[PDB]
Ligand binder design. Structure first.
Ligand SMILES: [Mg+2]
Ligand SMILES: [Mg+2]
Lengths: 217, 114, 162, 131, 138, 111, 45
RNA sequence: AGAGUGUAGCUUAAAAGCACCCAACUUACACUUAGGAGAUUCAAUUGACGCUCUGA
């Protein structure tokens, strides 16, 4: 049979911010830090807070707090640089800085002649080159960005089919180191979608089961 | 009657008339009383769906109910021969304390000659 | 004694060239002792500055209302790690089974792709990644609103160029 | 008859075990001795991830052979911005690995990736080091 | 773990030579499921981190359910069946509560394997078994 | 020149003295050995130089039983914990099936 | 899943107190560390 | 649409045994000790839900 030669990749950004900790996890950090305190021993902070105190409490009748609020005032003047780019935008889902706590996938669109296929980015492999660099040639061309971005593996992650002449698709995986996505308001119709956000961005079984190679969390 | 006095190399010694074996497992703890031949004479496991009702508390429970049953079977002398790490296990100390106080003595008096 | 067998093989004969390798090896003793990196020990070991000063903060109590609370949170924790480990363990289970068929397909499809897939790329040797943080940020050590911890460049020196 | 048709009934040494690279051509290179280095500015978080790695490897039956520690860095505030002084230290620890495949390679990195906590760094490599 | 495996091998057939040769419902589980779920709350898990387990109710539960299975063991270990019936087992489903009189009170009971004195067994025992025509035989 | 000197030790005379199926009274030495070749089984003792003797008057048999050592025997509990999980050790043992029943009840009087 | 290694004690016997210090990097990013002398902030040049 | 069927992870287990999870020791692992968690897809061998298949 003639088989329609086609390649792909899948791109993932890591969470740059740790997960917000669950209501059971927040208590455990409170108890474990409590039990850390009572087993503790020979504190340089408290060597000068309890036992320099008893000479300053009896010199008058014959350090600890003046260093406190200075440790609070730079704790106060430093407004913490926000973990918040969610409620401000709410819309620009093609942002490289939308989600902070979860991994993403790059997701594009090609209005085909036959269907009108919303696409998880693909490739075509020539009879000369490998299947591995077939991933590597497409982040340069199809979206016009500068992603110095490590690939992981030569053996692929996903294999789904459609035969009318049969077709094939070979899903890989990769990461980001940093991101220069050139001209993000481009009409190459692309968007940065989480796991929870592609539930209503996929219709088909050629893309419905590509969740079988994401880290689920 | 003879105890099998040999087996000085292997563990446990098979010199007894009646032994106490316990089977610590997942979800259960068993306690068997055997003869030399391997014929179990009384048992009390938490599979029994009678002590399934009402863990260390599961272990010391069987020391109550099986020491109840050896007196009801005429078995008065025992031997308990554990590995040295379950001899210092907090379950078996409560088992033996419900067994030696429950009536039986785990010491096997000597095979008299002469 | 392969450290000193270069030495007396150069000490016995004594041309000029033999005095260079013997001299350099005394440096290269201490180069190898700084190339191999037994001189350091761990700080797992306890300083006994912590020995006698244990008796500064010894006071604890325990209460039944604390203890019953300290019971169930650990059981819920033993519950919480149990299912999420399974979610993680079925994740690696599902992502190998989506590898295993995905290799058997092209290997039973194309023999060129058969050999090409089972090797990898040697960019797994220089891989290094830094952790998720609490703040990413959009910048930084503060751009000059009034705060900063970046080293600011007027009469420019962090380095000799700027 | 000394030997018997029951000869060799107790042989306790071929069953038991007694007493670089991973070559493996074509499938190729089945990653051998790799030192994954767990580094943190903390102490407890670094240890708790080596905790997580070692239990992960034995769960996946891929062989580990060391868990030792690189000793501790001795740096102050680096006096590059009244000149500041406070000693912040770094705790590095080695986790080794011996058995890996090509086909588990990129995957087993992901479980290390996705579970990696706040402010710690990994660095895979080959072996030429000592304490 | 090895001692568990190795004591499995000493019950196998073993073609060579062995010391053993010369010297040898549906509503029931449904009610039990809610039983443990109910019984997991009144222990407040506060009786775990020291419960008593009253035996006498347990014994009445044992004698009804797993009494006869257990009771057949002692009747074989004591070798009744090879003396009574030349083999030919049976599992006694009727719980026979026989006891003798120590004067007025109390009762010295006989269980399956007990020891009662012939001073106690001068007079015929007081019998009940809570079942419905029988011949009792000593 | 013959630098080698000393190997003039005589033979130990160590082996099975009572082979399989023999009648053995209580106390006879079944075997003498060094470096365990036969372990004690039912009613067989061990002396200081590892000999095997009979503890009851009976008939000596040889079997192949399963070897589980003592948990204080530290030189051979590590022998276990490097075995794979299908493994059992199977040393060989010497038993004595006792012939005489250890006594009978006899009339002594009529009182 | 950055929480799997998150919560732990000090697994040593004799040890000083460790306080919840927020050190912060050249790249702007801050981290919850544990340190003595409870400066709630540290800033690295 | 056709099909194989079906006990929690597994099981020529029938509510079991292993695995598994958190602590306490261990650099850690392992061991051990204290704990923790669970299943017969549902209705009368049938009928009907869950998956994995063969479809378009
Ligand atoms: Mg000689
Ligand atoms: Mg001679």
């Amino acid at each position: 049979s003639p088989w329609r030669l086609l390649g792909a990749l899948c791109l993932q950004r890591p969470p740059v911010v740790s997960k917000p900790l669950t209501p059971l996890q927040e208590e455990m950090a409170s108890l474990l830090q409590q039990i850390e305190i009572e087993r503790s021993l020979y504190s340089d902070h408290e060597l000068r807070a309890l036992d320099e105190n008893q000479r300053l409490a009896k010199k008058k009748a014959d350090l600890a707090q003046d260093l406190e609020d200075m440790w609070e005032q730079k704790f106060l003047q430093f407004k913490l640089g926000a973990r918040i780019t969610e409620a401000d935008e709410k819309n620009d889902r093609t942002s490289l800085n939308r989600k902070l706590d979860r991994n993403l996938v790059l997701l594009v669109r090609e209005k085909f002649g036959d269907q009108d296929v919303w696409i998880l980015p693909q490739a075509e492999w020539q009879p000369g080159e490998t299947l591995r660099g077939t991933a590597e040639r497409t982040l340069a061309t199809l979206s016009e960005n500068n992603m110095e971005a490590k690939f992981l593996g030569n053996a692929p992650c996903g294999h789904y089919t459609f035969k009318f002449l049969g077709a094939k698709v070979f899903f890989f995986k990769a990461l980001l180191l940093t991101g220069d996505f050139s001209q993000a308001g481009n009409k190459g119709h692309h968007v940065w979608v989480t796991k929870d956000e592609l539930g209503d961005y996929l219709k088909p079984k050629y893309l419905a089961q590509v969740r079988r190679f994401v880290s689920d969390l | 009657a003879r105890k099998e006095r040999g087996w000085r190399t292997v563990f446990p010694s098979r010199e007894f008339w009646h032994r106490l074996r316990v089977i610590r497992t997942q979800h259960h703890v068993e306690a068997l009383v055997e003869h030399q031949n391997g014929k179990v004479v009384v048992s009390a496991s938490t599979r029994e769906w009678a002590i399934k009702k009402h863990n260390v508390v599961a272990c010391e429970s069987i020391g109550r109910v099986l020491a109840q049953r050896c007196l009801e079977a005429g078995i008065n002398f025992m031997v308990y021969q554990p590995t040295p790490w379950e001899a210092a296990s907090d379950s078996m100390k409560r088992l033996q304390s419900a067994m030696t106080e429950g009536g039986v003595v785990l010491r096997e008096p000597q095979r008299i000659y002469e | 004694p392969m450290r000193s067998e270069p030495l007396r093989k150069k000490k016995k004969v004594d041309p000029k060239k033999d005095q260079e390798a013997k001299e350099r090896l005394k440096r290269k003793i201490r180069k190898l002792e700084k190339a191999t990196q037994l001189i350091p020990i761990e700080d797992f070991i306890t300083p006994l500055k912590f020995l006698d000063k244990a008796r500064e903060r010894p006071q604890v109590e325990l209460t039944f209302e604390e203890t019953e609370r300290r019971a169930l949170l650990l059981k819920k924790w033993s519950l919480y790690k149990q299912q999420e480990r399974k979610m993680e363990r079925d994740t690696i289970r599902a992502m190998l089974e989506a590898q295993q068929e995905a290799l058997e397909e092209l290997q039973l499809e194309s023999p060129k792709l058969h050999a090409e897939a089972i090797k990898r790329d040697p960019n797994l040797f220089p891989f290094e990644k830094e952790g998720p943080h609490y703040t990413p940020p959009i910048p930084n050590y503060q751009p000059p609103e009034g705060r900063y911890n970046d080293i600011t460049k007027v009469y420019t020196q962090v380095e000799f160029k700027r | 008859y000394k030997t018997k048709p029951t000869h060799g009934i107790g042989k306790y040494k071929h069953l038991i075990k007694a007493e670089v690279r991973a070559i493996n051509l074509g499938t190729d290179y089945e990653y051998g001795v790799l030192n994954i280095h767990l580094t943190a500015y903390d102490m407890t978080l670094a240890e708790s991830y080596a905790q997580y790695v070692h239990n992960l490897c034995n769960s996946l039956s891929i062989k580990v052979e060391e868990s030792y520690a690189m000793p501790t860095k001795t740096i102050e505030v680096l006096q590059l911005q009244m000149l500041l002084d406070s000693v912040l230290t770094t705790h590095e620890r080695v986790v080794q690995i011996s058995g890996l495949s090509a086909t588990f390679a990129e995957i087993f990195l992901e479980i290390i990736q996705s579970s990696l906590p706040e402010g710690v760094r990994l660095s895979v490599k080959e072996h030429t080091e000592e304490d | 773990r090895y001692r568990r495996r190795a004591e499995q091998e000493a019950q196998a057939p073993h073609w060579w030579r062995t010391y053993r040769e010369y010297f040898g419902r549906t509503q029931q589980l449904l009610e039990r499921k809610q039983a443990i779920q109910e019984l997991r709350a009144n222990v407040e898990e506060r009786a775990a981190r020291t419960a008593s387990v009253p035996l006498d109710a347990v014994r009445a539960e044992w004698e009804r359910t797993c009494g006869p299975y257990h009771k057949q063991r002692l009747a074989e270990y004591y070798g009744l069946y090879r003396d009574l019936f030349h083999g030919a087992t049976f599992v006694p489903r009727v719980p026979l509560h026989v006891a003798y009189a120590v004067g007025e009170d109390d009762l010295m009971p006989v269980y399956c394997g007990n020891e009662v004195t012939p001073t106690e067994a001068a007079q015929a025992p007081e019998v009940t078994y809570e079942a419905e025509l029988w011949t009792l035989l000593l | 020149s013959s630098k080698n000197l000393g190997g003039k030790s005589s033979g130990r005379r160590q082996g099975i003295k009572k082979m399989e199926g023999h009648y053995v009274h209580a106390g006879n030495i079944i075997a003498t050995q060094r470096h365990f070749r036969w372990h004690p089984g039912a009613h067989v003792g061990v002396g200081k130089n590892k000999c095997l003797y009979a503890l009851e008057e009976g008939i000596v048999r040889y079997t192949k039983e399963v070897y589980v050592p003592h948990p204080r025997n530290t030189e051979a509990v590590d022998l276990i914990t490097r075995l794979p999980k299908g493994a059992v050790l199977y040393k060989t043992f010497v038993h004595v099936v006792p012939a005489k029943p250890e006594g009978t009840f006899k009339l002594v009087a009529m009182l | 899943d950055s929480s799997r290694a998150s919560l732990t004690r000090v697994h040593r016997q004799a040890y000083a107190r460790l306080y919840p210090v927020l050190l912060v990097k050249q790249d702007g990013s801050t981290i919850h560390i544990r340190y003595r002398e409870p400066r709630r902030m540290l800033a690295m040049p």
